[PDB]
Symmetry: D3
Subunit: 138 residues, 6 copies
């Protein structure tokens, strides 16, 4: 119930006008929004977000895209919010994403995948701490 997850709507999600849509899907699940802000990520932050792929191909283009414009960062709170958050977004692979999910309804690309969610509670604590100051959290 005090569980928290980090959700980030990426620059494509913002440009396509899907910010309210994504938030609505978490509100209607019954999750509690406890932190929220918009910002344009720096290159260093984009690199941090994708640090697991630095030796991986096209890492630069991922980084460029992530910092190509403003994103919206959220912290959602609730039971199983990390795992439920993943389910709401849908499969990482649009060839497997199901309609009813955000990526299923809106995402066509696996890299520009509209939104990000924490893959574990461990990832979430780290991601929340990275993007948010303690004070910004209700």
């Amino acid at each position: 119930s005090s569980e928290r997850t980090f959700i980030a709507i990426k620059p494509d999600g913002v440009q396509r006008g899907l910010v309210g849509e994504i938030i609505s899907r978490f509100e209607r699940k019954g999750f509690k929004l406890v932190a929220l802000k918009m910002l344009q990520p720096t290159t260093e932050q984009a690199q941090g977000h994708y640090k697991d792929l630095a030796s991986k191909p096209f890492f630069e283009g991922l980084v460029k895209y992530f910092s190509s414009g403003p994103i919206v960062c959220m912290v959602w709170e609730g039971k199983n919010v990390v795992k439920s958050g993943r389910v709401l977004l849908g499969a990482t692979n649009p060839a497997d994403s199901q309609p009813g999910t955000i990526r299923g309804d809106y995402a066509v690309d696996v890299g520009r995948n509209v939104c990000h969610g924490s893959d574990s509670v461990e990832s979430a604590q780290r991601e929340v701490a990275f993007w948010f100051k303690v004070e910004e959290i209700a």
Copy 2:
């Protein structure tokens, strides 16, 4: 076109799960979101927000309500966005609000009117400066 307005979703709007709904209505109109944050207002900020009603007996209930929980602050950018924002929200008094507008669809109280919008370009410049730092405001295309 570089015009900006301040929109605030109040604690009832947040508690009732209307945050995304309200944002979606501005995105559909074609307005550009350039600042966004959640915060729990201090008593002082709530009082500043309602400063024109400081001598009224319900000034107290407004402030108490406004700071009762987290709110969501936005800055929207676009042509006529200030007046258009008012039109999207609907009449401040839901008893005058038309369905299709946010207050028309969701608000039942004149006090709990879900959200606030700037009444002028002058008010908007003031409200944005009050709630937002220059850095917190984006400039994308």
Copy 3:
């Protein structure tokens, strides 16, 4: 706030699959559902419902239409719920109805106007007693 109004979705509203849509619009406004049932009106009930038009030549077509199939009866509770219910429904004549309202979005006929709402607190008290038993009305918070 303990105020109650009677809302009826008519047979066309039911046949066109608008039952949930209409109920959702009252839930969003923040009104409280306290009675709900489906029934097929008798000729006598339909006539009672339209009693003020009993001397009109289209009284017959109204009654026939009203009892043509099952209707859905509701009682909604909340502040200003009677007048607000009327505003949510829109003008009785869809030719005067504004988009955003139920008749504005869905109704094309002045006769088949999808739904009915009580015109006053007095009418509502009468209509609820006519369509509902005291037991059929809930009292929750």
Copy 4:
């Protein structure tokens, strides 16, 4: 085509303002609503609804919750309406419920699961007869 199923929106479903939403999902499937009422279940009825769990744990709290406030009872008619009704609601387990379904979109708990549907035609005939008088059915 004369097949019928029983659907009950539970006290949480009513308080969260989801009554119209759930009905809309059955109307848009093309099912025919033939009985509908709101009532606050008695303790005896709540016990009846959960009779399969009386020797099961926290049975009292389930019963308390079911009768904690008004519910909305429905009878929907159509082909495969029992099985289709289950699919529309989604998996009993929110860790398996899919977005697009009612529980997938709205339910976070497995007990307070927003709504109920008949698990079989046999269960349906019994449930419909229990909650509804023959006269209340169109």
Copy 5:
């Protein structure tokens, strides 16, 4: 009831992904779709469409915009469908448009007003003949 009107979704409406949304609003009203096509207007057709403004200096920007990409042409059938179509679209100038209407919800420019509707039965008969062949128009129940 056999009345018909011409509705056109303009290139901005198509590019912004509002085609289905606009069609859904006419289907909900209960109007009957009897002709539908996508095409990219020629300069000559765009000029014909705006012929009443041929002497105006912004005639050029309208035509350029109207033929900037594919549009979607529709013919809707039903009682009062011409005037009702106008009401569903909302004021031609989004600065007068009410939320609940298409322009009220989506349009920000007086020039880019998303869509067009026939202003009269006379205009509709003319517009349908101009954009559609007799064969392209269905007659179902």
Copy 6:
């Protein structure tokens, strides 16, 4: 990215007022509509659409239904639009169609399945060419 698929909303889809709904689901996926028209199919065309089933049962009734009224033909363009198009529609079998998909939300029958999508790129090139003239395509 130049990939195209053929989508046809059938006479039931049009009568139930689902034309805008289906189109909206492709627009929000990010696919590009490049051809669109309404027409009442001839018997010969209905036979062509179902040619794989001519030796199959009730083939006549399928044909009668397909030409029972006006349909809406579309060509959608985008990456994986053929396969994504299938996923958006959902399983051919309503006992397997998932809510969130068009058939999952609206279709109750396997024959009157609301809409049609190309099963392959090969089928798509053929179907597009059959229903559309080159000029009708943007």
